[PDB]
Amino acid sequence: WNWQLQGLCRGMDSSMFFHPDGERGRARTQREQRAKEMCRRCPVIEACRSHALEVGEPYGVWGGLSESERDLLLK
Amino acid sequence: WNWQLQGLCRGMDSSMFFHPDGERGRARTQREQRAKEMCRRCPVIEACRSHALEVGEPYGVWGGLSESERDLLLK
Amino acid sequence: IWNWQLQGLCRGMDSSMFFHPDGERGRARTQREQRAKEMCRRCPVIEACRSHALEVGEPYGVWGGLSESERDLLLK
Amino acid sequence: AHHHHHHVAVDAVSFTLLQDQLQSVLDTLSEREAGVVRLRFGLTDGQPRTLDEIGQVYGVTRERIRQIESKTMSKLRHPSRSQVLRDYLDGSSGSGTPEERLLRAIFG
Amino acid sequence: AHHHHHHVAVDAVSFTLLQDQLQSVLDTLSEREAGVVRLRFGLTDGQPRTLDEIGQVYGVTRERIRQIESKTMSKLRHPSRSQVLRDYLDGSSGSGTPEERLLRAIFG
Amino acid sequence: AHHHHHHVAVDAVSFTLLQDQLQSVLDTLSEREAGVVRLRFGLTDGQPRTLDEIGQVYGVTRERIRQIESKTMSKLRHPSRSQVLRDYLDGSSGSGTPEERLLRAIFG
Numbered sequence: 001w002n003w004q005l006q007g008l009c010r011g012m013d014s015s016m017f018f019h020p021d022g023e024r025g026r027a028r029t030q031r032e033q034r035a036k037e038m039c040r041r042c043p044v045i046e047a048c049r050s051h052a053l054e055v056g057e058p059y060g061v062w063g064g065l066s067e068s069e070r071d072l073l074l075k
Numbered sequence: 076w077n078w079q080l081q082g083l084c085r086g087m088d089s090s091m092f093f094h095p096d097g098e099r100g101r102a103r104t105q106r107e108q109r110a111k112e113m114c115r116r117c118p119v120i121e122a123c124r125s126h127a128l129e130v131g132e133p134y135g136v137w138g139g140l141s142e143s144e145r146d147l148l149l150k
Numbered sequence: 151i152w153n154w155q156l157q158g159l160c161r162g163m164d165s166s167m168f169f170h171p172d173g174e175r176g177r178a179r180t181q182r183e184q185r186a187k188e189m190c191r192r193c194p195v196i197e198a199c200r201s202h203a204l205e206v207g208e209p210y211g212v213w214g215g216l217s218e219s220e221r222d223l224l225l226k
Numbered sequence: 227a228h229h230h231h232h233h234v235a236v237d238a239v240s241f242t243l244l245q246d247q248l249q250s251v252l253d254t255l256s257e258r259e260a261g262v263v264r265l266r267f268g269l270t271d272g273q274p275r276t277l278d279e280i281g282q283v284y285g286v287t288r289e290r291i292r293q294i295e296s297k298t299m300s301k302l303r304h305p306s307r308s309q310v311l312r313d314y315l316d317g318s319s320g321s322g323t324p325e326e327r328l329l330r331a332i333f334g
Numbered sequence: 335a336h337h338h339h340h341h342v343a344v345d346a347v348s349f350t351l352l353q354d355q356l357q358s359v360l361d362t363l364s365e366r367e368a369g370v371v372r373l374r375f376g377l378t379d380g381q382p383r384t385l386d387e388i389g390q391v392y393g394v395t396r397e398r399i400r401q402i403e404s405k406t407m408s409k410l411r412h413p414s415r416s417q418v419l420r421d422y423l424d425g426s427s428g429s430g431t432p433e434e435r436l437l438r439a440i441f442g
Numbered sequence: 443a444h445h446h447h448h449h450v451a452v453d454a455v456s457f458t459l460l461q462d463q464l465q466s467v468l469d470t471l472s473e474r475e476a477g478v479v480r481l482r483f484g485l486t487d488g489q490p491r492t493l494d495e496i497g498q499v500y501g502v503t504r505e506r507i508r509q510i511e512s513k514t515m516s517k518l519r520h521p522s523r524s525q526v527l528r529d530y531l532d533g534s535s536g537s538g539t540p541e542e543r544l545l546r547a548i549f550g
C-alpha cells in the first residue's frame with residue numbers, strides 16, 4: 001500500500017489509532033480526536049480514507065474517520 | 076505433463092497399470108485388460124499414448140497400449 | 151566476474167603466486183612478482199585484468215602484469 | 227540459526243518469508259492478539275484451530291475471538307505499524323544478512 | 335522443522351523442492367523402490383551409488399537394479415500417481431504453509 | 443544438513459547463497475584472513491565488529507586490520523580464486539544437489 005510510506009502516523013504509537021477493549025465514552029472520544037488531529041496533517045489522508053472505505057476496515061481511525069463514521073458512509 | 080491433469084487413472088492405484096515382478100500368464104493378461112478398459116474411457120488417451128511412444132516409456136500400460144504393443148509400433 | 155575472469159590463466163593457482171606474504175621484502179618479493187608477471191604475460195585477458203585493477207585501484211596483488219607499487223605510480 | 231524461511235506465492239506475486247521477521251511482527255501485538263494469531267493459523271504446532279478451540283483457551287466466546295482476529299488484521303495493515311509487515315514481505319531482499327554485508331564489501 | 339528445501343534450475347526453469355514433499359513422493363513407492371532411489375541419487379548420505387553397490391545392498395544383480403530404477407522412473411511419471419510429483423515440483427507456491435493462511439487473512 | 447541458505451538481492455540481481463559454499467570460499471583464506479572476515483561481517487555471532495575490536499583479537503592496530511581486510515577483499519576478487527566465488531554466487535542453480543540428480547533422471 002504505497003501511499004502508506006508517507007503516512008504521518010508511520011513512526012507513532014499505534015495505540016493512538018486503535019481503542020483498547022472496553023474504552024467507551026469520553027476516553028474513546030479523546031483518543032479519536034487526537035488521532036484525527038494527526039490525520040488532518042497527513043499527506044495521504046485521502047488515500048488512507050479511500051483504502052479504509054473500499055475494504056471496510058472494521059477497526060481503527062483511518063483517513064481522519066472513526067469506524068462508526070465510515071460505517072455511516074458505507075450504509 | 077498438463078494432459079495428465081485429466082487422466083482417468085489419477086485417483087486409481089498404479090498397480091492397475093504396472094505388473095508385479097515375475098507376473099506371467101493369465102494374471103498378467105487380466106491386469107493389462109483391466110488397465111486398458113480404463114484408458115479406453117479416458118479423455119487423454121491420445122496424449123498419454125503420444126507421450127509414451129515419443130519417449131519410449133519402458134514399463135506400464137499408457138494410452139491403452141502395453142509395453143510390448145508400444146515396442147512393436149516403435150520397431 | 152562473469153566475463154573476462156573466466157579466461158584468466160591464473161584461475162585455480164595458489165593466490166600466494168600473486169600476493170606477497172605479510173612483511174615480504176627484498177629479493178623474495180621481487181622473485182615472487184617476476185614469477186606472477188611471467189604468467190600474466192601469457193594470459194589472454196591481461197588487458198582486461200590490468201584495466202579492472204587500475205579502474206578500481208585494487209590495493210594488493212599482481213594484476214594485469216603490474217605489481218601493486220607499479221599500479222600506485224600509474225594512479226598517482 | 228536464522229535461516230528458516232518459506233517461499234509463498236499469492237497470485238502472480240512471490241514472497242520469501244523469514245521466521246525471525248514473522249516473530250518480530252508477532253512481537254508488536256499484545257500477548258492475546260499474538261496468541262490468537264498463532265493458534266488460528268497454526269504458526270507453532272502446524273494445526274490451525276477453530277474459533278471454539280481458541281475461545282476455550284482464552285475463556286471467551288467464538289464471537290469474541292472473531293472480533294480479536296478482525297481487529298488484529300486491521301492493526302497489521304494500518305499505516306502506523308505496517309512497516310514491520312512490509313519488512314516481512316520483502317524477505318527476498320536479504321536486507322540485514324551477514325551475506326549482504328559480505329557482498330557489499332566484495333562488489334564495492 | 336519443515337523448512338528444508340532446495341532451489342534447483344533445470345534448463346530455463348526453476349524449482350523449489352521441499353524435503354517433506356520429497357518424502358511423500360518416496361512414501362508412494364515400495365520399500366525397495368524407494369531404497370534404490372535413495373541410494374542411486376544419494377538422497378540420504380549424499381553419495382550417489384553405482385548399480386553394483388546397490389545390487390550388493392539388495393542381494394541382486396546390477397541388471398536387476400537397472401530394471402528397478404527404470405520401472406520406478408516410469409511409475410513416477412505415470413498419470414496414476416504423478417499428482418504427488420506435481421505437488422513436489424510446485425514447492426515454490428508455499429501451498430499449505432501457515433504463512434499462506436496468514437497472508438490470505440491479511441490480504442483478504 | 444546442507445540446506446542453510448540466504449536469498450539476497452543486490453540491485454536488480456538476486457542470489458541464493460549456500461552456507462556450505464560460503465565455507466568453501468573462507469577455506470581458501472588463511473586463518474587470520476578468514477577470522478577477520480568472519481568478525482568484520484558478523485558471519486558467526488551476527489555482530490559485525492569494529493576494526494578496534496578485531497585489532498584486539500589479533501593483537502595488532504586498527505590500521506593493520508584495515509590492511510588485512512583490504513588485502514583479503516583483493517584476494518577474493520582476484521581471478522586466481524574467482525571460480526570458488528562464481529560457484530558461491532550461482533547457488534540458485536542447485537548444481538550438485540541430490541535433487542538435481544533426481545530431476546535429471548525423471549525428466550530425461
Ligand code: SF4
Nearest residue numbers: 007009039042045048
Ligand atoms: S490519514 Fe491518519 S491513519 Fe492514515 S496514514 Fe495519515 S495519519 Fe495515518
Ligand code: SF4
Nearest residue numbers: 082084114117120123
Ligand atoms: S490413457 Fe490410461 S494411463 Fe493414460 S492417463 Fe488415461 S487412464 Fe491413465
Ligand code: SF4
Nearest residue numbers: 158160190193196199
Ligand atoms: S593478467 Fe595475470 S592476474 Fe590477471 S587473469 Fe591473467 S594471469 Fe591472472
Ligand code: NI
Nearest residue numbers: 227228229230
Ligand atoms: Ni537459521
Ligand code: NI
Nearest residue numbers: 229446448461
Ligand atoms: Ni546464515
Ligand code: NI
Nearest residue numbers: 233339447449
Ligand atoms: Ni529458499
Ligand code: NI
Nearest residue numbers: 335336337338
Ligand atoms: Ni523445517
Ligand code: NI
Nearest residue numbers: 230232245337
Ligand atoms: Ni516455518
Ligand code: NI
Nearest residue numbers: 443444445446
Ligand atoms: Ni542442511
Ligand code: NI
Nearest residue numbers: 338340353445
Ligand atoms: Ni536436502
